[PDB]
Design an enzyme around this catalytic site. Structure first.
Site, short mmCIF file in Angstrom:
data_model
loop_
_atom_site.label_atom_id
_atom_site.label_comp_id
_atom_site.label_asym_id
_atom_site.label_seq_id
_atom_site.Cartn_x
_atom_site.Cartn_y
_atom_site.Cartn_z
N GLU A 297 -15.31 29.34 29.22
CA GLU A 297 -14.72 29.84 27.98
C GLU A 297 -13.61 30.86 28.20
OE1 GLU A 297 -18.44 28.77 27.34
OE2 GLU A 297 -16.87 27.31 26.91
N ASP A 339 23.30 29.61 46.19
CA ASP A 339 24.73 29.83 45.99
C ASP A 339 25.22 30.90 46.96
OD1 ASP A 339 27.37 29.96 44.75
OD2 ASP A 339 26.63 31.66 43.59
F1 ALF Z 1 28.82 30.35 45.76
AL1 ALF Z 1 28.90 29.84 44.05
F2 ALF Z 1 29.06 29.32 42.33
F3 ALF Z 1 29.12 28.14 44.58
F4 ALF Z 1 28.70 31.55 43.52
K LIG Z 2 -19.88 28.34 30.37
MG LIG Z 3 28.36 32.78 42.06
#
Ligand code: ALF
Ligand SMILES: [K+]
Ligand SMILES: [Mg+2]
Ligand SMILES: CCCCCCCC/C=C\CCCCCCCC(=O)OC[C@H](COP(=O)(O)OCC[N+](C)(C)C)OC(=O)CCCCCCC/C=C/CCCCCCCC
Ligand SMILES: CCCCCCCC/C=C\CCCCCCCC(=O)OC[C@H](COP(=O)(O)OCC[N+](C)(C)C)OC(=O)CCCCCCC/C=C\CCCCCCCC
Ligand SMILES: CCCCCCCC/C=C\CCCCCCCC(=O)OC[C@H](COP(=O)(O)OCC[N+](C)(C)C)OC(=O)CCCCCCC/C=C\CCCCCCCC
Ligand SMILES: CC(C)CCC[C@@H](C)[C@H]1CC[C@H]2[C@@H]3CC=C4C[C@@H](O)CC[C@]4(C)[C@H]3CC[C@]12C
Ligand SMILES: *[C@@H]1O[C@H](CO)[C@@H](O)[C@H](O)[C@H]1NC(C)=O
Ligand SMILES: *[C@@H]1O[C@H](CO)[C@@H](O)[C@H](O)[C@H]1NC(C)=O
Ligand SMILES: *[C@@H]1O[C@H](CO)[C@@H](O)[C@H](O)[C@H]1NC(C)=O
Ligand SMILES: *[C@@H]1O[C@H](CO)[C@@H](O)[C@H](O)[C@H]1NC(C)=O
Ligand SMILES: *[C@@H]1O[C@H](CO)[C@@H](O)[C@H](O)[C@H]1NC(C)=O
Ligand SMILES: [K+]
Ligand SMILES: [K+]
EC number: 7.2.2.19
Lengths: 987, 262
Positions: A297, A339
């Site tokens: 529960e 990135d």
């Molecule tokens: F390194 Al990037 F968008 F490709 F910040």
């Molecule tokens: K139970």
């Molecule tokens: Mg960037």
């Protein structure tokens, strides 16, 4: 959906296609018709899903549906019983109400678990321009950007965001900011002549919502609204397939396990009840009891509470999360697609290297200036530092004395800002040094000149000589210079010196850096008096035969923590990939610096260069690293993408578009991997939405990235990824501990009912008391197990296998249910029989006694002593049995939480009181047991009796046996790792 | 071969068999020790037997209570009541009371030593005839024929329980809600006053007194209006018998709805 190919078309072909005029533009009637046709020039925000509809899904699930069915049985039983006139089972209605309340509270907890309050779609409006100058019928007039349609001849000027994808026809020094596309703020020229086949890289295509920095340019509109590049990116980002999170998958799996066991028990014993002689309504109530005992529960709620506590711990380090499910994904992550610009680097050009004295000096590039510095005690160095101070026009914003130097705001070129900040960091005040050396002639960077020159009067009044200082390209200054500051002296130029200079230039260029030359000449007071006006256009300066000072290179440098963070992530078994839009050479330089590429690892081209062997013959298996740009990746098929991913463990994707980032992410995911994406830009947003968990930078991040992400680094500290990995793994381990503890007490709540049905003993435990165990005494101790330390080196462990490693697997479930739960059942039944016998009801008499015990017409039933009992007195004795079973479970649960602290380590070794929350939860459990037993009125309120103390003491041996046997099991697991014991009885 | 090979199935099954065998042995040891400690004559505690319950014969239960309805003119209406009263008194026939001995103490029958055969204690004789006029003789209908039914009230026996010896515990039966024009219910009791003699107490248990028979009180109602639904409550007026337990309606008192038809 159309792809841009108009950049290759000429003016005549554009005119024929769009029925527009290169100078007049579109006619107003045609523009209105085209507006009616294509809609506005604005992005369409997806509606999404309603709040309440998502809430409705929360009130469903395995446990939810079981509790709905159980409440349905209770209500049906109460209605049928009442329809006959019996009203004694008001407890059935109270059970129904409490089960509904449990369902609703669980639904609220589930809704709060997956809830994001971010609108996401509303991010793509602050990038959209409001106003757009358009030439219709030969008149330049201003209109809102929403009204633009394809074929409109649009004029744009600097400072104004581009209002649509525009085929540029006329350009006068126009430069744009294509960061929303490539992640790079480096200004890009716009000119009508096509430079590339791909519409992205050409110079004659401006893009919707890109800030036009400077100059003026004219163009025709080729795409509007969602048909633009930014529209495609917004559609991929906002509208993507919803993906279930790994912890959600695990929760649904163990809900399947519990639902299966509950249905199994319920149906098996419903059949048993039907065969052995029970009515259908009675067997239905039995099935309800068995389901309630089998269902946890409070478990889903305690899971949410544990997630909240982990989120609090993370946010204490400025690591805010957006749904509690995100708190776990990083611990499970085995791939980090990352990135480059802004994420792994601070997105600020700074001085990287200096070349003078025939030596390459590395300058410190960290933002807090906590790194290693270079040697600054050379005469050539001092002359060079003056020169780079002097050749600069940029200035700071006054009043920023408090703000650190690297973070201080400047106006100028990127190179100028880097050089100014470097000079301010090396010296006291570059403004002071440049003002005390007054300027008399200023020749800025010119296309024809190809350099910058300036004439300065020396600070010391005793030297009226004028210092010429110059900055430009290495090779372009080489032909303009004749001597060179070497070792602090003026040295003539030889072929050896030119070879050294060329080698330095090639080295610094191959590190993905822009290199700028520096040189100086001293003008004597003989030819140039102090009152000699140094005219620019006169060119009375020799302007040549100067003395080369030293070469300088600039690069966007990694953040200070990032190399350590990446190395720790790789030690934790996580594959680290760089996906970027920057150029391949810079991307490879940054990968080498940060640690994505190890030292010694090389590419196919590196091996080919080392061996002087062509690329084709270089065996791929020997290349540990691989740099793939957007062109190659674009024609690469999915099979080849997977093959490359397998072949090279250190991968760098460069020059890639946002769709390519998404393709890479989904390729990694298709390989059974949990992928995190770390980004800060608009082009990162589709990948951030596709990823299992998306992490966005807080300061440097853009709104689209932040809205798409699941976690934000408020302080921009990349090392918080390491903390998130540690906390995710820790919360996974502690979650399974807490789940095992919660599941254990289900069996002691089920076994009384099976014994009741089968042996017909008086009811040992009630449904109300079962709910009290689940909702009150089980909640605090299980949640307190979220505060356990890590037993082993989790950060050195490899990531769990999502197919193999599970939250609740068969070992966990089996141990909890059929060993610990069995002991707790035996404890409860020992206490039950002891309490019964001390009150006159011997164990043999209890067997088969249910029919006479529960007879309202039998008011003189005899016990084992011959004493005659009424129904009310028998009921109160039954309530005593309830309490004795409840207290047995509570004490055995104290021992169980003491053993659940660890799975492979001893309690004596880790310490009993390390976790204060656990001991407080134990004290709490005992206190609530005592309050429920001994508060006045409870026998009538919740069927709790004031029990004698020996009945508290009876289950302590069973608590001790649980503790001892679990400790011996862990001891065996530790002593013999390669054993059947460790293989079968570890969980 | 579901999850693991057959040999491993045997091993895990053998381990679980050993585990459950050891736990069952521990449980059997605990129950053995408990029965070793349990005293064979007196219960350890009487937490729920503070006041004795009260039951009546014939016991005919209606809607969550004792509902007795009969029509005098039709014999088959009360044939069941008469038959069950006879069956209940067959256990008080003097043949069955042979095991018990006669007593005239008229005071508590305390016994500390086992003087009866095979280490037992004496019980006192309560026979059918002691009910006299409701005893099934010489009228076999118990007065249900003539509208004056004879109801036997019995007290639930509790070990070592003394109902107070200021005077013998007594029965007082009356209408629960007295009608304003209705006269109070007159009942003749057998034995005199409808009292349980003090030498039947204390009860020492089924093991100490295997032949114990509870004393009875026969309440013959005489003031029951015909064709009217009346509710009658019988209480035990003893010092240590309390009838103020709303949760248990039979503790010290018994109520029954009666409707005598004509
Ligand atoms: F390194 Al990037 F968008 F490709 F910040
Ligand atoms: K139970
Ligand atoms: Mg960037
Ligand atoms: C998934 C598979 C599960 C399998 C579970 C198997 C459970 C096995 C456990 C018990 C089986 C029987 C054990 C009985 C041992 C009794 C030992 C014994 O010899 O005692 C003696 C008594 C006789 O006393 P007396 O009349 O002489 O005393 C009068 C007092 N004087 C003597 C002073 C006069 O004999 C007695 O008590 C007889 C009555 C014994 C009590 C009945 C127990 C039945 C209930 C069992 C449920 C137990 C919990 C199961 C939970 C499983 C968890 C998964
Ligand atoms: C996946 C599907 C699997 C299906 C497999 C099924 C296998 C087992 C099925 C059947 C085997 C047992 C056969 C039973 C024979 C009939 C017994 C019977 O007809 O008894 C009668 C008593 C009722 O008389 P009363 O005195 O109560 O009436 C009082 C009436 N009043 C209250 C009004 C006064 O029945 C009662 O109601 C009270 C109960 C008393 C008798 C209990 C007998 C059960 C004992 C052992 C069964 C063990 C099964 C364990 C399965 C383990 C699963 C993991
Ligand atoms: C995590 C997974 C857990 C799964 C656990 C599943 C548990 C299911 C276990 C099933 C075991 C089957 C037990 C069958 C017991 C026999 C039932 C029975 O029919 O009982 C016969 C007599 C009852 O007495 P009676 O009918 O004469 O009284 C009635 C007086 N009247 C008629 C006036 C009301 O009991 C006797 O004689 C004494 C019989 C002694 C039986 C001891 C049983 C202990 C076994 C296991 C614990
Ligand atoms: C009666 C004979 C033929 C078979 C007896 C089986 C009995 C002893 C029961 C009692 C406990 C049961 C076990 C309880 C726990 C487990 C671990 C689980 O992950 C697999 C099933 C398994 C192993 C069960 C198999 C059946 C089992 C071993
Ligand atoms: C009682 O029984 C007699 C005989 O069967 C019958 O005549 C009479 O109607 C019954 N009493 C009532 C109130 O119906
Ligand atoms: C117990 O006593 C009775 C008489 O009170 C006698 O009939 C019986 O034989 C005795 N039993 C034993 C075992 O002595
Ligand atoms: C008791 O029985 C006698 C026997 O003669 C009788 O006279 C008397 O009326 C009866 N008492 C009652 C109350 O009926
Ligand atoms: C009542 O019992 C007590 C002992 O419990 C005794 O001392 C007293 O004399 C008795 N009273 C009468 C009237 O017999
Ligand atoms: C009880 O019976 C006696 C006869 O010994 C008598 O004196 C007394 O009045 C009766 N009391 C009641 C309440 O009937
Ligand atoms: K995501
Ligand atoms: K539980």
């Amino acid at each position: 959906a159309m792809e841009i190919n108009d950049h290759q078309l000429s003016v005549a072909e554009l005119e024929q296609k769009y029925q527009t005029s290169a100078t007049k533009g579109l006619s107003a009637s045609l523009a209105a018709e085209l507006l009616l046709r294509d809609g506005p020039n604005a992005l369409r925000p997806p509606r999404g899903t309603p709040e309440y509809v998502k809430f409705a899904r929360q009130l469903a699930g395995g446990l939810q549906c079981l509790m709905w069915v159980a409440a349905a049985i209770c209500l049906i039983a109460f209605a049928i019983q009442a329809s006959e006139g019996d009203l004694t089972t008001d407890d059935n209605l109270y059970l129904a109400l409490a089960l509904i309340a449990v369902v609703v509270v669980t639904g609220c907890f589930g809704y709060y678990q997956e809830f994001k309050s971010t609108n996401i779609i509303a991010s793509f409006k602050n990038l959209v321009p409001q106003q757009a100058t358009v030439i219709r019928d030969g008149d330049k007039f201003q209109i809102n950007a929403d009204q633009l349609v394809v074929g409109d001849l649009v004029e744009m000027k600097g400072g104004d965001r581009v209002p649509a994808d525009i085929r540029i026809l006329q350009a006068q020094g126009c430069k744009v900011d294509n960061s929303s596309l490539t992640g790079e703020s480096e200004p890009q020229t716009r000119s009508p002549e096509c430079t590339h086949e791909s519409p992205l890289e050409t110079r004659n295509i401006a893009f919707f919502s890109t800030m036009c920095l400077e100059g003026t340019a004219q163009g025709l509109v080729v795409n509007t609204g969602d048909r633009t590049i930014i529209g495609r990116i917004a559609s991929l980002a906002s509208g993507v397939e919803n993906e279930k999170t790994p912890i959600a998958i695990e929760i649904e799996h163990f809900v399947d396990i519990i639902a299966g066991l509950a249905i199994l028990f319920g149906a098996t014993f419903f059949i048993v009840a039907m065969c052995i002689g029970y009515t259908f309504l009675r067997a239905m109530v039995f099935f309800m009891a068995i389901v309630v005992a089998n269902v946890p529960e409070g478990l889903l709620a305690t899971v949410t509470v544990c997630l909240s506590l982990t989120a609090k711990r993370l946010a204490s380090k400025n690591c805010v999360v957006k749904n509690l499910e995100a708190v776990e994904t990083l611990g499970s992550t085995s791939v980090i697609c990352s990135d480059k610009t802004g994420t792994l680097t601070q997105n600020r050009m700074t001085v990287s290297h200096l070349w003078f004295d025939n030596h390459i000096h590395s300058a410190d590039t960290t933002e807090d200036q906590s790194g290693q510095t270079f040697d600054q005690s050379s005469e050539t160095w001092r002359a060079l530092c003056r020169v780079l101070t002097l050749c600069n026009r940029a200035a700071f914003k006054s009043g920023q004395d408090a703000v650190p130097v690297p973070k201080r705001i400047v106006i100028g070129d990127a190179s100028e800002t880097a050089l100014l900040k470097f000079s301010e960091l090396t010296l006291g005040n570059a403004m002071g040094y440049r003002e005390r050396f007054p300027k008399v002639c200023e020749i800025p960077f010119n296309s024809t000149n190809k350099f910058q020159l300036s004439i300065h009067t020396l600070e010391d009044p005793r030297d009226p000589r004028h210092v010429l200082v110059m900055k430009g390209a290495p090779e372009r200054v080489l032909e303009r210079c004749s001597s060179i500051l070497i070792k602090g002296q003026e040295l003539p130029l030889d072929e050896q010196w030119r070879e050294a200079f060329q080698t330095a230039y090639l080295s610094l260029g191959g590190l993905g850096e822009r290199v700028l030359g520096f040189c100086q000449l001293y003008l004597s007071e003989k030819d140039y008096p102090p009152g000699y006006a140094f005219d620019v256009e006169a060119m009375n300066f020799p302007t040549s035969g100067l003395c080369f000072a030293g070469l300088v290179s600039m690069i966007d440098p990694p953040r200070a923590t990032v190399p350590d963070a990446v190395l720790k992530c790789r030690t934790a078994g996580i594959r680290v990939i760089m996906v970027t839009g920057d150029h391949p050479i810079t991307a490879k330089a940054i990968a080498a610096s940060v640690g994505i590429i190890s030292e010694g690892s090389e590419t196919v081209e590196d091996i080919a260069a080392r061996l002087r062997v062509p690329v084709d013959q270089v065996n791929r298996k020997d290349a540990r690293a691989c740099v793939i740009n957007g062109m190659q990746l674009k024609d690469m098929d999915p099979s080849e993408l997977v093959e490359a991913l397998r072949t090279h463990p250190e991968m760098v994707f460069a020059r890639t578009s946002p769709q390519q980032k998404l393709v890479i992410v989904e390729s990694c995911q298709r390989l059974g991997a949990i992928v995190a994406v770390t980004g800060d830009g608009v082009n990162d947003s589709p990948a951030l939405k596709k990823a299992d968990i998306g992490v966005a930078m807080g300061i440097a991040g853009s709104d689209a990235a932040k809205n798409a992400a699941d976690m934000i680094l408020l302080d921009d500290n990349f090392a918080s990824i390491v903390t998130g990995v540690e906390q995710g793994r820790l919360i996974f381990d502690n979650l399974k501990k807490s789940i095992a503890y919660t599941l254990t007490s289900n069996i002691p709540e089920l076994t009384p009912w099976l014994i009741y049905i089968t042996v017909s003993v008086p009811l040992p435990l009630g449904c109300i008391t079962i709910l009290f165990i689940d909702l009150c005494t089980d909640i605090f101790p299980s949640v307190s197990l979220a505060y356990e330390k890590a037993e082993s080196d989790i950060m050195h462990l490899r990531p769990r296998n999502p197919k193999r490693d599970r939250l609740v697997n068969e070992p966990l479930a089996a141990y909890s249910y059929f060993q610990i739960g069995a002991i707790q059942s035996f404890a409860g039944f020992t206490d039950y029989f002891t309490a019964m016998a001390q009150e006159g009801w011997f164990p043999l008499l209890c067997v088969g006694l249910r029919p006479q015990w529960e007879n309202h017409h039998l008011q003189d039933l005899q016990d084992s002593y011959g004493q005659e009992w009424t129904f009310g007195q028998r009921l109160y004795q039954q309530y005593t049995c309830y309490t004795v079973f409840f207290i047995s479970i509570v004490m055995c649960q104290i021992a169980d939480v003491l053993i659940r602290k660890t799975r492979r380590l001893s309690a004596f070794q880790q310490g009993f009181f390390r976790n204060r929350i656990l001991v407080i939860a134990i004290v709490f459990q005992v206190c609530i047991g005592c309050f429920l037993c001994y508060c006045p009125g409870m026998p009538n309120i919740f069927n709790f009796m004031p029990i004698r103390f020996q009945w508290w003491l009876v289950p302590m041996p069973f608590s001790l046996l649980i503790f001892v046997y679990d400790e011996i099991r862990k001891l065996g697991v530790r002593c013999c790792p390669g054993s059947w014991w460790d293989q079968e009885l570890y969980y | 071969m579901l999850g693991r090979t057959l040999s491993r199935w045997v091993w895990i099954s053998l381990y679980y068999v050993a585990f459950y065998v050891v736990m069952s042995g521990i449980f059997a040891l605990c129950i053995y020790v408990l029965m070793r400690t349990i005293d064979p004559y007196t219960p350890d505690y009487q937490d729920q037997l503070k006041s004795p319950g009260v039951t009546l014969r014939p016991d005919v239960y209606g809607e969550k209570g004792l509902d007795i309805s009969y029509n005098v003119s039709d014999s088959t209406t009360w044939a069941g009541l008469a038959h069950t009263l006879h069956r209940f008194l067959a256990g008080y026939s003097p043949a069955a009371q042979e095991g018990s001995i006669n007593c005239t103490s008229e005071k508590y029958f305390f016994q500390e030593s086992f003087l009866a055969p095979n280490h037992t204690k004496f019980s006192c004789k309560f026979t059918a005839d002691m009910l006299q006029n409701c005893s099934g003789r010489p009228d076999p209908t118990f007065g249900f024929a003539e509208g004056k039914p004879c109801f036997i009230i019995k007290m639930n026996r509790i070990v070592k329980f003394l109902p107070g010896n200021s005077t013998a515990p007594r029965v007082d039966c009356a209408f629960l809600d007295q009608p304003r024009d209705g006269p109070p219910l007159q009942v003749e009791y057998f034995p005199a006053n409808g009292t349980y003699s003090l030498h039947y107490f204390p009860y020492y248990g089924k093991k100490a007194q295997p032949h114990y028979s509870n004393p009875l009180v026969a309440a013959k109602l005489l003031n029951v209006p015909r064709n009217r639904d009346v509710v009658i409550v019988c209480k035990i007026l003893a010092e240590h018998v309390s009838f103020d337990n709303p949760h248990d309606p039979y503790e010290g008192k018994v109520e029954f709805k009666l409707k005598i038809q004509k």
